[PDB]
Design a protein around this ligand. Structure first.
Ligand SMILES: Nc1ncnc2c1ncn2[C@H]1C[C@H](O)[C@@H](COP(=O)(O)OP(=O)(O)OP(=O)(O)O)O1
Ligand SMILES: [Ca+2]
Ligand SMILES: [Ca+2]
Ligand SMILES: [Ca+2]
Length: 341
DNA sequence: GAGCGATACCGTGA
DNA sequence: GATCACGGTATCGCTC
């Protein structure tokens, strides 16, 4: 098949540049400001000016301020970015019926029945870049190959404001030459683990024994790497359904008493139901971060949808089951809702 | 032995 | 004891 992947470049920061173009050319750091100390939280996305001096997603805000104290630090306006993204997504819908909206900044197009070769696909990509830039002033990066993974790899390599093809010859080279840590889905935990056997390339997952791999990284990820290494990865471009909506919050002081926790928990439910909008969940989970920072979760699934009032009652029962079963104190508390109608 | 959904930890940034 | 959101996924209980 022929797959076309489009990533929005440094998306949260870019949208802020578009909404305030003065920021263009200066370093921009969109952060989540979270907890107790002022400037606590983490960096969500940096533009390239900021990534040049070390500021990147996931580092603490105060450490970014040590590196670039004069950069523009903005809070996350996730509702804004989602509205922009939903508009770009509707732009991309006019290029095939087979669209997988993978995340707020990414989507996969199956364009097999709309073009016959990579040269036509490529040309379609520039048209998609041009259209998104023209109508929304957002640069994207396109990646094109025989399946979702290598199409995304093509994007990873061409970013930012780029476009790249990976043909079947390149696929074979990359199966031999690319670093597994750079395979999509393979994060740092799993990547490090693959230094057990210093598995550094896809083809290496064929030397090792299947049960060994399985026992280190899990069956799902093992099957995944094998099928790639074998170049018999096919995964249809499907329309995705949201799996989970929720909200966690950080409390001013560690607590263990229901009545001080209840207010944060109810805020989290309120904010969660706001984002749910028309979606009715049948499952709920109370999630709590402990004073030592382990996460602990208890849920219940219902045969029906969960009204807000039931969420309120059940969430308390679930928080109570948390406080009996674990003796530690609680630092953060939230809910997550799942199993939509 | 194995299907099926729930569960709660786990890992990625989809 | 300094991150949130989502959803991945190994396992478990129930069951035939
Ligand atoms: N450690 C983290 N903590 C919080 N948010 C994170 C973290 N890592 C990633 N994110 C979120 C915010 C980023 O905007 C979003 C995209 O992840 P990332 O892989 O950094 O971007 P990307 O592949 O889309 O690259 P680029 O931003 O250059 O387009 O994921
Ligand atoms: Ca991006
Ligand atoms: Ca992305
Ligand atoms: Ca990434």
């Amino acid at each position: 098949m022929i797959v076309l992947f489009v990533d929005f470049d440094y998306f949260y920061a870019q949208v802020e540049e578009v909404l305030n173009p003065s920021l263009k050319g200066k370093p921009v750091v969109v952060c989540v400001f979270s907890g107790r100390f002022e400037d606590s939280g983490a960096v969500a996305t940096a533009n390239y000016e900021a990534r040049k001096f070390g500021v990147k997603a996931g580092i603490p805000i105060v450490e970014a301020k040590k590196i670039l104290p004069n950069a523009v630090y903005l809070p996350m306006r996730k509702e804004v970015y989602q509205q922009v993204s939903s508009r770009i997504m509707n732009l991309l819908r006019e290029y095939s019926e087979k669209i997988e909206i993978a995340s707020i900044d990414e989507a996969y197009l199956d364009i097999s029945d709309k073009v016959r070769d990579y040269r036509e696909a490529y040309n379609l990509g520039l048209e998609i870049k041009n259209k998104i830039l023209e109508k929304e002033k957002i640069t994207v990066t396109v990646g094109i190959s025989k399946n979702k993974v290598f199409a995304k790899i093509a994007a990873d390599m061409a970013k930012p404001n780029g476009i790249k093809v990976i043909d079947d010859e390149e696929v074979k080279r990359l199966i031999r030459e690319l670093d597994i840590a750079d395979v999509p889905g393979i994060g740092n935990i799993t990547a490090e683990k693959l230094k057990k056997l210093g598995i550094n390339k896809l083809v290496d997952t064929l030397s090792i024994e299947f049960d060994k791999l399985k026992g280190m990284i899990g069956e799902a990820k093992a099957k995944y790497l094998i099928s790639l290494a074998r170049d018999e990865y096919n995964e249809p471009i499907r329309t995705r359904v949201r799996k989970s909506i929720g909200r966690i919050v950080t409390m001013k002081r560690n607590s263990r008493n229901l009545e001080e926790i209840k207010p944060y928990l109810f805020r989290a439910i309120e904010e969660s139901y706001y984002k749910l909008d028309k979606r009715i969940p049948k499952a709920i989970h109370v999630v709590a971060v402990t004073e030592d920072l382990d996460i602990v979760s208890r849920g219940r699934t219902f045969p029906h949808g969960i009204s807000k009032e039931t969420a309120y009652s059940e969430s308390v029962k679930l928080l109570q089951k948390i406080l009996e079963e674990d003796e530690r104190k609680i630092r953060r508390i939230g809910v997550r809702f799942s199993k939509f109608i």
